[PDB]
Amino acid sequence: GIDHTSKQHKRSGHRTAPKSDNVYLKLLVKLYTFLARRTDAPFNKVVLKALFLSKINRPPVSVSRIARALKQEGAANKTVVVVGTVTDDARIFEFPKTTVAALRFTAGARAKIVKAGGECITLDQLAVRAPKGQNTLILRGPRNSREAVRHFGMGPHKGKAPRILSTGRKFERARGRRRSKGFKV
């Protein structure tokens, strides 16, 4: 027998393929499991992983998040990658040229990006132009933005947000919320 120090037969807590059944997605996945295996180039090893992620872990990169990321110094001529889908943002007016590799573009998103004289390519299109991620600028969306995570850590004085199905006064607003009704959180 062995005094074990570690849980035996523990599996890594890590996705190993995408959960999806999307034929095409398993092809991209088949692409970059080759690119990441047969090149160094940190970039591939990253996208190959990013492909396995679930819809929460792939929050949308916005069109304006792209516009701003390009204002970075020595950025403007890089091609921004978004292993996930890119949405449109009514709120920027000036939107630069540049070519954007994503998984999906909303209608209005490739609209903006094209009309600005720019390109909208799929990832495998990126793969051929840049087998090593040359001039790629990977972008990730605001994960902790979900309505869901508002309630994570709900507790006295935690400042979080109750799971309350229908809000207002008369809805968890009295005893335990104000010094005048019992106490305060």
Binding site: G1, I2, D3, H4, T5
Partner: protein, 223 residues
């Protein structure tokens, strides 16, 4: 490319020829380093006697340790120590550098292990027969010198006797060289433990504790 292959292949048969003679040069040296040092302590004793004094030896810089207790019903503290010394199954063994801060581990761990001072002979047969190396978490036998150099080369050490040397002499990269060695998985002693019961002290009637020099006869029947 048919004349580029032998061009590199015999560029490696060349390389391997040199390393093989360097090793020879070293191993032949080490021999005398031992041969002399051991001789010296002999005559040092004879001389101090001659002059009516007493040569007293340097305290041992190295011990080898064998866990001789099973895994269950062990108290938390010595249990912890037993692990940090990589001794987490019965009859496994490791080498320990003797300093105050390891000496008190051996204390804490004593009625579960039997240890002492290994001879060159024992350290040699232990590594040859049962020496495996730790590489990428894996336990790999030391079948060829290439394996050691691949991993201990950065510290010197590019042969098995380089390893042995760094162990018995202790010093510089003992930490690394010794950690490179997987804990030794010894068998039960062929010929028995020489004692009615193992879990008394070696002084009290056998096994467990520092049996000093005597460790060697044990490990040789476990090896």
């Amino acid at each position: 490319t048919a004349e580029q292959v032998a061009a590199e292949r015999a560029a490696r048969k060349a390389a391997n020829k040199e390393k093989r003679a360097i090793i020879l040069e070293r191993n032949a040296a080490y021999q005398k380093e031992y041969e002399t040092a051991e001789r010296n302590i002999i005559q040092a004793k004879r001389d101090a006697k001659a002059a009516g004094s007493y040569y007293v030896e340097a305290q041992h810089k190295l011990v080898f340790v064998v866990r001789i207790k099973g895994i269950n019903k062990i108290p938390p503290k010595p249990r912890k120590v037993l692990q940090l010394l990589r001794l987490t199954r019965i009859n496994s063994g490791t080498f320990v550098k003797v300093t105050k801060a390891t000496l008190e581990l051996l204390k804490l761990i004593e009625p579960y292990v039997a240890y002492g001072y290994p001879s060159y002979s024992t350290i040699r047969q232990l590594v040859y027969k049962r020496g495996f190396g730790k590489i990428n978490k894996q336990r790999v036998p030391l079948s060829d010198n290439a394996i050691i150099e691949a991993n201990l080369g950065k510290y010197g050490i590019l042969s098995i006797d380089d390893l042995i040397h760094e162990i018995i002499t202790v010093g510089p990269h003992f930490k690394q060289a010794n950690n490179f060695l997987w804990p030794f998985k010894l068998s039960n002693p062929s010929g028995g433990w020489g004692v009615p019961r193992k879990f008394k002290h070696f002084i009290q009637g056998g096994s467990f504790g520092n049996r000093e020099e005597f460790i060697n006869k044990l490990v040789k029947s476990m090896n």
